[PDB]
């Protein structure tokens, strides 16, 4: 019952910037991860950036260093800042929510020397 | 109701390799993402690798290129292959499941020359 609304798309010139926004509404209290995906012409949809509740972020290799994901927790908004755009960035961009579950008990790894 | 069990931790020699496994049980039909996390002594727990149902993977900067996450869908197992271990990798490692939701309608971005 999460609802996601993406905005900010449009036309850019190569070397330009855009900022996308994703507004979540509905019952969002359990949502503790958010992601931006893109579908370039002809290709599989791919994760380009994600952010979790602790503020940790991860990016795909194709956008790492150029794109930045950030969030406004008080308004349930997630942003995608896209810098140094290329024609290879042309795509439909999608927002997606996630509910990350419980952890296991864990396993100790000890590296010596 | 999903239950996760991590195994395969132990003592590794500097520069050695380890393979961790995480077995999921319970009602797993909706689980469409899995992640490995680690908790270095004194520090926040951190994502190090994640995999989704389409086989896409993502890694933290600290492990990208050394660690590989893979899955056996038929047995509900995920694995973390850890190579060239150093003392900086000593930690408790945890598995975590996730349910990723619907996408939004998407927003077109078109970059020209
Ligand atoms: C990692 C993402 C994350 O954890 N969230 C998030 C989700 C989408 C977009 C931005 C952030 C939280 C979801 C729950 N909301 C709280 C409850 C609420 C309800 C209505 C208005 C304001 C707040 C805080 C942020
Ligand atoms: C990216 C993760 C993912 O999508 N999954 C997954 C989850 C945990 C660990 C490995 C993979 C699927 C979850 C549902 N199972 C299906 C049914 C079933 C039941 C009992 C035994 C075997 C299979 C297929 C794999």
Numbering used by the authors:
A (entry chain C), B (entry chain A): 1 to 113
From the paper:
Variable-heavy-heavy domains (VHHs) or nanobodies are single-domain heavy-chain only fragments found in members of the camelidae family (camels, llamas, alpacas, etc.). To explore antibody applications beyond traditional heavy-light chain mAbs, we identified and biophysically characterized a novel single-domain antibody specific for fentanyl from a camelid variable-heavy-heavy (VHH) domain phage display library. Our lead VHH (JGFN4) was specific for fentanyl and displayed no cross-reactivity with the closely related synthetic opioid carfentanil. The recognition of the fentanyl by JGFN4 was driven by hydrophobic interactions between the bottom of the binding pocket with the N-phenylpropanimide moiety and hydrogen bonding with a tertiary amine in the piperidine ring.
JGFN4 expressed in E. coli was purified as a mixture of monomers and non-covalent homodimers, separable by size-exclusion chromatography. Both the monomeric and non-covalent dimeric forms of JGFN4 were subjected to crystallization screening and yielded crystals in the presence of fentanyl. The structures were determined by molecular replacement phasing and refined to 1.68 and 1.55-Å resolution for crystals obtained with the monomeric and dimeric species, respectively. Unexpectedly, both crystal structures showed a domain-swapped homodimer of JGFN4, with each protomer bound to one fentanyl molecule. Interestingly, the homodimer formed as a result of reciprocal swapping of the C-terminal β-strand of each protomer, mediated by an extended conformation and intermolecular interaction of CDR3. Fentanyl was surrounded by CDR1, CDR2, and a juxtaposed loop between CDR2 and CDR3, which formed a turn of a helix. The N-phenylpropanamide moiety of fentanyl is inserted into a deep pocket formed between the two layers of β-sheets that form the core of the VHH. Hydrophobic contacts are made with A24, M34, K71, V78, and R53 side chains and van der Waals contacts with the main chain atoms of V31 and N32. In CDR2, R53 also donates a hydrogen bond to the carbonyl oxygen atom of fentanyl and to the S29 carbonyl group from CDR1 to help shape the pocket. Hydrogen bonding is also observed between N76 and the tertiary amine nitrogen atom of the piperidine moiety on fentanyl. The phenyl ethyl moiety N-linked to the piperidine was pointed away from the protein and exposed to the solvent, where its conformation was crystal form-dependent.
